[PDB]
Amino acid sequence: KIFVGGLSPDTPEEKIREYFGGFGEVESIELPMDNKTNKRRGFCFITFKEEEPVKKIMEKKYHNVGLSKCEIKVA
């Protein structure tokens, strides 16, 4: 699974699968946590199936999505 620092108002899942799912079909994704009233730690993860694609994604911590290049620390 991987983690992005896009923490946008709405994780473009469908667009997410287009990119991340592009590295390899996605099983399910993950968005930032709820509440949002403690420390500055809001992002959006995504889980896949095998493990290889993470190797790739993680290899490019800073990719690009649609019109943004959120960060990407595997998860």
UniProtKB/Swiss-Prot annotation:
Compartments, as annotated in UniProt: Nucleus; Cytoplasm
Residues with N6-acetyllysine modification: 61, 69
Domain RRM: residue ranges: 1-75
Modifications after synthesis and translation: Methylated by PRMT1, in an insulin-dependent manner. The PRMT1-mediated methylation regulates tyrosine phosphorylation.
Phosphoserine PTM positions: 8
Crosslink site: Glycyl lysine isopeptide (Lys-Gly) (interchain with G-Cter in SUMO2): 15
Entry-annotated residues carrying Phosphothreonine: 11
Function according to Swiss-Prot or TrEMBL: Binds with high affinity to RNA molecules that contain AU-rich elements (AREs) found within the 3'-UTR of many proto-oncogenes and cytokine mRNAs. Also binds to double- and single-stranded DNA sequences in a specific manner and functions a transcription factor. Each of the RNA-binding domains specifically can bind solely to a single-stranded non-monotonous 5'-UUAG-3' sequence and also weaker to the single-stranded 5'-TTAGGG-3' telomeric DNA repeat. Binds RNA oligonucleotides with 5'-UUAGGG-3' repeats more tightly than the telomeric single-stranded DNA 5'-TTAGGG-3' repeats.
Quaternary state and interactors: Identified in a IGF2BP1-dependent mRNP granule complex containing untranslated mRNAs. Part of a complex associated with the FOS mCRD domain and consisting of PABPC1, PAIP1, CSDE1/UNR and SYNCRIP. Interacts with IGF2BP2. Interacts with GTPBP1. Interacts with EIF4G1; the interaction requires RNA. Interacts with EIF3B and RPS3.
Name of the molecule in the record: Heterogeneous nuclear ribonucleoprotein D0
Upper classification of the organism: Eukaryota, Metazoa, Chordata, Craniata, Vertebrata
